[model samples]
Target: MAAAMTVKMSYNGPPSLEDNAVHAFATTFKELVEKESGGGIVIDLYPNSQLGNEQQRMEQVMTGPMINVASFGGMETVFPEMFATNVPFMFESYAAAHEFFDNSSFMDKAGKELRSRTGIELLAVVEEGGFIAFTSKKPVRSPADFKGMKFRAMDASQVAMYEAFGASGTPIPWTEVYLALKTGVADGQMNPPTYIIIGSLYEVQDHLTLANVQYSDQFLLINGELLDSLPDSQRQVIRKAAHEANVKTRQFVESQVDERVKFLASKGMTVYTPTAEELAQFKELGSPSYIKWLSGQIDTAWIDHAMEDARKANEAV
Candidate 1:
């Protein structure tokens, strides 16, 4: 008789149909592994942040206890060079993103570096549409509108971007955003439409400005020690499960964004899309921050390769 192989997975996001990426990963990984291994393998899922915050969950994965797998909002802390991908206006469409991930060897090397340096294996990337737009009591039409506005920002790269745009970036946890808006502790927040709708930001904020400034993604990872201890067959099963989860979650998130955008309009929130010239200006302003950050950390040649891949991908589409 063989010993049972159990993998415990945990996600920091809430448990909702809106959080389909996390839900799909947890559900599909459990079902596929159990079915294929004939009860020899099992996966336990902890969702809704029942385990802890993002930082805490990451620590759990590193320690090889409490959780065996975690999906986080990129590895900016562990690998700051990877933050170049989220640079404002770097990717214009989903096709560009798909191209870079599929065709760029630079991305593959970056992933390998993350695993080697951090002891956390990168499995798949779950896309979360793009960076948020400004939602405020009044319309924010230009960079000037951002002046004196208190905006909520993630702890990641967006902090510098907001400052560059002349907005004060308030680092707030996602769970506290609603209250922050209601009490005016923060005047606005930037996030994908799906996150805005699911987080109930639409109820508190009346305006939506579609800046589409940055690309946001969460990386799926597993503890290196635990992964190393797994049998070859079990390792293959986990990889298959991760790939399936990534595809399902990406489609689910994209579909939800379309519906959520319409819902926001129906709720009377003003939705604003930037014009071509305005978008170009916004991109130009944001480019320097990322380029400066990427210097020295990541190879310049690989960055050029990624840009070329993105262009080719978009042209093909």
Candidate 2:
């Protein structure tokens, strides 16, 4: 029988063994959806941003017959409140982040808000990698070290984050990050160890700081209207497939984090883990700046709910 439905899946990474959490999620989701649907639904995947850049792919996904694994920067463009859960030092561990994002009432509310406002269905939030860390020519242990540094920021929230640390931030596209760093347009940047390894950023940056500043996550979204139009059974299959895919990807990240960080060091980058006291200082300075910046963009209610949810998540973990 001919396929009755089709979906487009887009992501930025290659489907390979070299530290690709989002791509893992994408491939698994495609396989499960197609197999479980018995060819009634088909999915076409465009990796390495073949479809377009993050923002462009998100625009296309919002239409119909499309799903995009979107980075926080991309989603924040469509929904500014996407930054509410991104406050620095918000999560203590992978478990805490998962608990908060997967089970929190606040996240449910945020999902509803996005669907209502943008006609997009939030399938699941996949862990892009482990916690975000800094990579630079110089090691950073405290906010003071950020002085006189200009780092590449992924978006306005990141720009605000660097500013909070007393550093200047220049927003740059991810595709341009390595070139910018090598050419001295930006001196430093932050990302998970997986990204550092996959993007070959360790080649440009000589030092890595395990700051654990924020948990890196990607949004798995589908067009709400398209999903609504689908048969109820097909919709359930899609949702279940997304959840299973995310579970596998999350496990992959958690299992490989130590090896990923080791890979960075093996590539001749100095690895530094901040002292607990120094980490406290980072939270002390960075959290307030992030919350203040987030509140100005959206309502304080989001901030309140996110913080409350985070606290509960930590305690539960």
Candidate 3:
């Protein structure tokens, strides 16, 4: 009789159909791993913060206890330099992002760097739609309108962004964002429409500002030692499964965004999209802060290479 290998996977996002990408990965990875390993590998799925929030789950990954895998957006905190590509307005479009990620040596180097620095392997990049926008009781048409508003920021990068735009950013745990808005602990939050709807933000926030400040990508990570321990054959199976799952998840999210946007509007939320000039100004205001922050944390050579890759990717598109 052989001992069964249990692989634990977690995502900080709540268990909802809206979180289809992570859900798909969890289900597909489990099924494939089990099938390939002849039922000797057992994969456990933990969603809805069951393994704690993103930061907590990341800590668990670092310490090697809570789970074998976690999906999160705050990979920058762990691999400060590598995640700079995720800075606001970094990619012109989803097509550009796909190209850059698929063709860039920077991404490969960054992944290797993350594994070396954190003892966690970067498995795949999971697209979480686009950057975020703010929903408030009042309309926010300009950077001036952001002043004094309590914007919920999930990480230091976000905090700097909001502050740069003259808003007072309050760091809040994502799980508490709903209650924070409902109770007025925070006046507003910036997130993609899919997230706002799935997280039930519309129940408390009536105005949606389509700022689209940054394009967000979640990192699928695993304990390096855990992954390395797998037999070479099992390792290959897991890698193939990961790539397949990523492709499916990306397509699923892209297809759903338009429908989700319509659904959010139907929920009685007033959606405000900025004019061309307004968007230009918003991007101008937010982009520099991220670049400055990234300079201090990441390798400038790597950043330059990524920028070149992104430009080529966009041009090709």
Candidate 4:
């Protein structure tokens, strides 16, 4: 059952030239398709918003077979049901996020709702970068350091997360983040270390805090119609390829985290590594407020399930 279709897949990520996990995923994924499909079904890989931004591309994916797949950062905008997993401090450790995502909770139930609500199948998720860190002009040592500061936020959940930290949220488009930082439009922003360098945000922001407030994860989104249209063999190949990319890329990303932080320091950016007590204070302030705010937007029963699984995993460890 070979359709021999050329499906268009858009990758929403940092610059195409950067040596990061996203780039590796695109490369590794392409090789997987080639190796497995033997040119049976080709993927026209478009990276760096060559298709459109996250929202626009998601819309296209939802619409039809024109753009079959798109990557997503904040799914709350188009698929609000995903806010449960996207909230601040949802998991204390990367281990917990791993446990939840690896289990049936996210992929079976949550993925099902995401497709039903948004008309796009949530095919898979991998860390966008390792985890979230703050980059600013001044050191964010504590909640006091966060007072009155304005940082760029991509979605409503981010705005709530910032407000809980005693800072004001400046909503801005991702393409404008560098200009926003350079022109004093926003005091700071949060992203992974790869982006801080690849995006050239360090040139404007001088400080970084090792705050894993939230994990930066991206979604592989495909249209429902196109996905259902795929032959069983092609669908199996696609899923296996994505799983392999994500599994390998996580180790690749974690190994780079420390080295990249040091790289940031070399460039005159002050990188602050917070103690456990300091991280707890941040969690205490931001977690509850975010959960309370986000619960209104979506059924947070999944949050409880994700939290419980994470707790058990951490306890066992």
Candidate 5:
């Protein structure tokens, strides 16, 4: 069949399916959708930010017919409650996180609200990287070590998290992270292994802490009106394609993290994994401040729903 509809897709990453998980998702999703639709649905691929930045693409997706991959920060601008998924130590394992995002009623409710408010469908959550880990100039074995440290945070909630553990936090632009760490503007930062490797932060940061602070996730969002306009069969095709693409990205990240950690160590970064008790200390001290900060930004009910849902996920998994 000839192409019936062409969907514009945008992602901010390299085109390498082997190296960039987001692009892996983008490519896989495009392939599956095109094949499953028998070419009825065409995907116009825009990788490496050919369209614009995440926030820009997000706005475009909301206003018209487009699909974009956006990070939690960008999504939170449209729906602040999305940040609830990033609470430190919330997910005990990959399985639990997957379960929570895929099946939890909280997510279903949140998705509906996001569609209703922004006219952007919350299509799928891609695990862009395995999990967040800390990279610093010095070792951080426990909350005590965070005292007097100034870490680079992605947002104010993370700043609040650092403050809870007796440290200061500074929000830095993604491009300037290495320079910030190298020039002493910030002492440490956290990201998944893939990002650290991509940015070459291993050169500036000498210590790597496996704290599992949060899951690094990106959302596949489409204009709600566009999706709603599609036939039921086409909608089914897109959703199925999204799920398979997400699984491919998640599996790739999960399989590569251990080797990536080893690669960081080979690049001369000291890698450390805290003991169970130390991780517990981090959870006890760090989670509440973020929760409080998030509540200040959004309704407390979102937090409650997220926490309870995360608990059930962990227990079930």
Candidate 6:
């Protein structure tokens, strides 16, 4: 630990300079590591994909050690079971989300194949923002409300969610969603409340709905080859920092929800925090269609086990 070293990290989220709580994630980790390491290690944090795109950066992380930690959309491309990880209404509550991850141990097993095939260390799930929420040109309180609108979706799974609501589902990249919403290329889109503020999306969208559906379940991945080269002391510190950062990130996202929604409201956007009955309509309608579609593509065992864990967690509450 005598030698000074720098750990390079990259992410594709909002700008690091903003008041965005998501930015605090990397900042806190960097501060912790430097203080704990006594100036032995420094984190070269790069935001907005200065290194490369998600898939390309992931490849870089696997093949080289120059870049250490990177966030990925999901591992569904490598393993199909992952498609079910972020299914709508999959985790009804925070407790349910933890239960699904802890009880299933699904990611632990999947990590083996991922390590063998790609050399990328799949770490814990980190919420990039809070749960997914719907924002639009007007209040979309129910499925019927979604009809006759162009809903911009990030993937086919979400496209299905939108289409089932009787809206035109259009696939658009994350970078372009803002412009699409601004220019009327798409009538509505979904994101965490933090995103609405982070991207200044509230300016373009007139309504905010706290749907809390279909989170991305983003992963913190490390370059196995690079990580192994670190001293065990440094490795332990790194993993500990990652864990703490993930927890803090989740807490930060949760605390900011009401604040962000209120801010959007002040900006003239109608913010609708749905009641249990209204939310049930969204979950009840979306989950059935989503489950039916995912069942055919993913292992029934994976689907059932995740559902069982979610159910057990909800029961405990």
Q: Best-fitting candidate, measured by TM-score? A: 2
Colliding pairs, model 1: 132-190, 132-191
Number of backbone collisions per candidate: 2, 0, 1, 0, 0, 0
**What is the per-residue lDDT of model 3 for residues 45-131, given as tens digits with 9 covering 90 to 100?**
887667777777888887772243343335646776654676667777888888887668888888887888888877777776655
TM-score of 2: 0.97
Which window of 10 residues has the lowest lDDT sum in candidate 4? 66-75
Candidate 6, clashing residue pairs?
none
Q: Please, what are the lDDT tens digits per residue for candidate 4 over residues 1-317?
A: 73577778776555353455676776777678768977876777776666666677777888877333343333656776566676567665767677667664555777777778777776567765767899999989766688899898877787888888889888776667899988888999888897787777888999999888788777777777887787898788878887887777777787778888888898899989888888888888877888888778766777786566556655654
Determine which window of 10 residues in candidate 1 has minimal summed lDDT.
Answer: 65-74
lDDT of model 6, residue 122:
64
Count: clashes, candidate 5: 0
- Candidate 1 residue runs with Cα over 4 Å from true position: 65-74, 293-309, 312-317
Per-residue lDDT of 233 in model 5: 96
Better of 1 and 3 by TM-score: 3
lDDT of 3 at 121: 79
Indicate the worst ten consecutive residues by lDDT in candidate 2: 1-10
Q: Of models 4 and 5, which has the larger lDDT? A: 5
Q: Model 2: residues >4 Å from true position, as ranges? A: none
Give the clash total for candidate 6. 0
Q: What is the C-alpha lDDT of each candidate?
A: 0.71, 0.88, 0.75, 0.74, 0.87, 0.72
Quality of model 4 by C-alpha lDDT:
0.74
Q: Higher TM-score: candidate 1 or 6?
A: 1
Put down candidate 6 lDDT per residue, 26-116, tens digits, no spaces.
7877887788877877887877666765556766776776443343233444555666677677766776676565445666666676778
Worst 10 residues of 3 by lDDT: 65-74
Per-candidate TM-score against the hidden true structure:
0.88, 0.97, 0.92, 0.92, 0.93, 0.87
Candidates in order: C-alpha RMSD to true structure: 2.7, 1.2, 2.1, 2.3, 1.9, 2.7
